[PDB]
């Protein structure tokens, strides 16, 4: 989940998956006016990793972000095409520095092997300056965990507060019921006295 949140921005992670731009407009006209929610169009790019997972794992990886998440077919397809999770060699093992520097140097194929990788709890993006020295340069940033993409309680505090509210309201209901019973007893006594007086 942390890897998905790092590779796929939270705006896209909160964005509604839309099949096409036409439906995007047609269903954003009534929705965006009410609630400002990002909409990510279902693209049509590649859905499979560009290279076999063996070559990726030769650097010390495990697989890809596409392999590391599941979910709705259209949403997963949009993630694989727009965000291209399958193009991200993702792992929970940090790469060896030798292979890291091998990736820093452009590969003999003409470019770097990958522009976005995840090793351990860190993410490395390798880019190149458009002009000037145009050095092929990496960038490593630590990856932080999150509870997204997990239908689990963590507002746990809200659950406890609501349970306390349930208990208090049930107790109040029982107390009111007891007061009603007392009122009924008083009414019965009054009616008994009235019957005695009438007799």
């Amino acid at each position: 989940a942390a890897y998905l949140a790092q590779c796929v921005d939270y705006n896209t992670s909160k964005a509604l998956t839309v099949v096409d731009s036409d439906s995007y407009k047609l269903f954003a006209n009534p929705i965006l006016d009410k609630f400002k929610v990002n909409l990510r169009e279902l693209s049509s790019a590649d859905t499979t990793p560009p290279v076999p997972a063996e070559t990726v794992r030769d650097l010390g990886f495990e697989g890809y972000l596409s392999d590391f998440i599941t979910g709705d077919k259209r949403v997963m397809k949009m993630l694989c095409q727009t965000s291209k999770i399958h193009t991200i060699p993702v792992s929970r093992r940090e790469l060896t520095p030798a292979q890291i520097k091998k990736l820093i140097t452009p590969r003999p194929n003409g470019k770097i092997l990958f522009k976005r990788i995840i090793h351990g709890n860190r993410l490395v993006d390798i880019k190149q300056s458009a002009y000037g020295s145009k050095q092929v340069f990496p960038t490593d940033v630590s990856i932080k965990q999150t509870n997204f993409y997990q239908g689990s309680i963590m507002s746990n505090e809200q659950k406890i507060r609501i349970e306390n509210e349930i208990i208090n309201l049930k107790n109040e209901y029982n107390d009111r019921k007891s007061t009603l019973d007392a009122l009924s007893n008083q009414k019965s006594g009054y009616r008994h006295e009235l019957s005695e007086l009438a007799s």
Partner: protein, 242 residues
């Protein structure tokens, strides 16, 4: 009322002058800058900072001065380093000085270069034209990394959509005005995002912080108006019920 109080607190903090440009990026950002300057031994390119003085907001763009501030303040935290050893030294100095925030590392030596290869050719002046640049090395680094030379600041939502549909020479991003609280970021021809302007002015603005103080005062006034409207509506409801 809590939102109004938070806006008042922000107004007081900005007005006191404690929201200094040096501390705008982070409270201990200056500590990190001093440490990298003192520990740029492995840095073939010094991790020069702060870049807000070198990359300041320019007038005529107060419509998205906050939007440009947000964008290039998210992008500004990336400094210039040469080799991954410099990234390790950056992490070491972060652990040493204990900077409250984290600085992304760009492993590219500073160099000055022409960006006319992908210069934006549109009616809207580029972000480079929207920013005062002092150091040519830092200016070139920002242009290359952020691709601001391929961006024209289109001023309206549908105008941005149409202009991106036209796709002139190097037109990728559009920063349109909706209000002083939030604006529009547009890309992809029809991709539109309503983005709230960044409250913390990390990016240096040539205009004094008093503009931010007055903006926060206006925000407080509008939120008090909203509070009054809500209170009156609920008072009407409760009066009818009673």
């Amino acid at each position: 009322s809590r939102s109004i109080q938070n806006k008042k607190v922000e107004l007081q903090n900005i007005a006191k002058g404690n929201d200094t440009f040096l501390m705008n990026f982070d409270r201990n950002m200056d500590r990190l800058l001093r440490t990298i300057e003192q520990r740029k031994n492995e840095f073939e390119t010094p991790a020069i900072g702060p870049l807000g003085s070198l990359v300041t907001i320019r007038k005529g763009f107060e419509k998205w001065t906050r939007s440009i501030q947000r964008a290039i303040s998210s992008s500004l935290n990336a400094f210039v380093v040469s080799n991954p050893k410099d990234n390790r030294l950056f992490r070491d100095i972060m652990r040493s000085c204990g900077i409250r925030s984290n600085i992304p590392i760009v492993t590219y030596c500073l160099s000055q270069f022409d960006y006319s290869k992908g210069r934006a050719h549109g009616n809207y002046p580029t972000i480079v034209d929207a920013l005062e640049f002092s150091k040519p090395e830092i200016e070139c680094l920002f242009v290359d990394l952020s691709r601001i030379e391929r961006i024209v600041l289109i001023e309206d939502k549908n105008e941005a959509r149409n202009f991106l549909q036209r796709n002139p020479v190097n037109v990728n991003m559009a920063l349109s005005l909706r209000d002083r609280r939030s604006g529009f970021q547009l890309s992809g021809g029809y991709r539109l995002d309503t983005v709230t302007y960044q409250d913390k002015i990390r990016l240096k603005v040539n205009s004094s912080s008093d503009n931010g103080t007055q903006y926060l005062k206006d925000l407080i006034e509008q939120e008090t108006k909203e509070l009054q409207n809500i209170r009156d509506r609920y008072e009407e409801k409760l009066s009818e019920v009673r």
